[PDB]
Structure 1
Amino acid sequence: MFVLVEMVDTVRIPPWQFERKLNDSIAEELNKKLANKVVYNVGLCICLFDITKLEDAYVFPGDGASHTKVHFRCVVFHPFLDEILIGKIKGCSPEGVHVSLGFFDDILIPPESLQQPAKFDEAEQVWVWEYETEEGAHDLYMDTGEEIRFRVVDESFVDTSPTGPSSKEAPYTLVGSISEPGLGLLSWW
């Protein structure tokens, strides 16, 4: 569920960091800028992998800081379509089962992709599932969040920006399915 993404970038190296070798400073400044942020079309950048080509360090007029163009690769949480993950449950909602995946928070399960013998709550928060012989209608998705196993079937990019005149929705929403046989909580199979 992790990929390499070859990216190019201009890294402004400030001039108090000239005593230090440039490769360590490029890595430090790129980790200070890409970590824990969602790039619009590739996903969530975890950390830098390596620097693969490091061009010449220009000095622009009006600033003493040396800019350089860096060819690098970065690990990115971007799970491809139809992929199985395991993660904790944060909480239940009328819109569905909000699934945390450790670091990443917005994995939503719609009601249309829950397991079919029960799809509805009795005006209670926690979502339920009914089997006839044991645990009829009292099985539940606990808010303490035992680990479930789901299957991502949709991902969506919104370009979260201040719309309107200037100078909170998630930019990386991920929608999965659980309805296949064998999925759900790990306690059920």
Structure 2
Amino acid sequence: MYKIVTVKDVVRIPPTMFTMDPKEAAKIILRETYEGTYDKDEGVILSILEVKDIKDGIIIPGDGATYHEVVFDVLVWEPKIHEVVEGYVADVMPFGAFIRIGPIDGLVHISQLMDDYVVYDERNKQFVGKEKKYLLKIGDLVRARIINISAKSKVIRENRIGLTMRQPGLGKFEWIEKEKKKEKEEGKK
């Protein structure tokens, strides 16, 4: 889930951008370096916001480009294990369903879709419960729980995320309403 992180960092500013002010040059270098990458501890680097303080450059032998201590805010989205997720199903597959949780997509296994048995109907390439007569189709809006996060590399595409859907308080909003109706009925009896 989205958050703002203030990070201190050293920026290698090449001689070709010596003309512009240090703030914009540091902003650009951080856009090229951090933006669009996955970090193991904070999530997905989405957008560099702004730089507050930039230090004077240090010339080190070998390159001639200036190195500056910088302070900046990065808008980063962090998935957290065992939390709640609001999203829509981007697509479905026989092994699992893809749930849009933000910058990256999550996977809901068919064994975690329903307590009831499910079958992958190929007529519309959609899921359908055996006895509940419920169904999932592309574009449906559902609520699920994140249960597993895996991070291979800094590429956001490769890292995968798996969710759960059977547990109480989750499901399609219509099913949530039906469960609320059942709760009201059992409270009234």
Q: TM-score, normalised by structure 1?
A: 0.76
- In the alignment, is the contact (CA less than 8 A) between 2:119 and 2:130 conserved in 1? no
Q: What is aligned with 1:181?
A: 168
> Unaligned 5+ residue runs, structure 1?
161-167
In the alignment, what sits opposite 1:165? Answer: none
| SS, match of residue 31 in structure 2 | helix
TM-aligned CA deviation for residue 170 of structure 1 = 4.2
1:59-79 deviation line (CA, Å, top 9, x unaligned): 232333212233434221113
1:163 paired residue number: none
Q: Distance in 1 between matches of 2:163 and 2:108?
A: 5
In the alignment, what sits opposite 1:155? 149
Q: Is the 8 A contact 1:35 1:45 kept in 2?
A: yes
**Structure 2 residue 134 is the aligned partner of structure 1 residue 142:** no
The alpha carbon displacement at 1:118 in A equals 2.5
Q: TM-score, normalised by structure 2?
A: 0.76
Residue of structure 1 in register with 2:43 after alignment: 43
Indicate if the aligned counterparts of 2:104 and 2:156 stay in contact, CA closer than 8 A: no
SS in 1 for 2:120: coil
Equivalent residues of 1:51, 1:72 under 8 A apart: yes
- Superposed counterparts of 1:16-55, under 5 Å: 16-51=16-51, 53-55=53-55
Which structure shows the higher helix fraction? 2
SS in 2 for 1:56: coil
Encode CA deviations 1:4-62: one digit per residue, 9 max, x unaligned. Answer: 44544332212232232212221222123222211233210111244355343112323
What's the CA shift for 1:130?
4.3
Q: Which residue of 2 aligns with 1:83?
A: 83
Number of the residue aligned with 2:128: 128
C-alpha displacement of 1:142: 1.0
- 1:153–1:176 CA contact under 8 A, matched in 2: yes
The root-mean-square deviation of aligned C-alpha atoms, in Å, is 2.7
Identity %: 23
After TM superposition, the structure 1 stretch with the greater mean CA deviation from structure 2, 76-85 or 5-14, is: 5-14
Distance (whole Å) between structure 2 residues aligned to residue 12 and residue 173 of structure 1: 32
Letter in 2 for 1:111: I
**Structure 1 pair 153–38 and aligned structure 2 pair: CA distance change class (3 A):** same
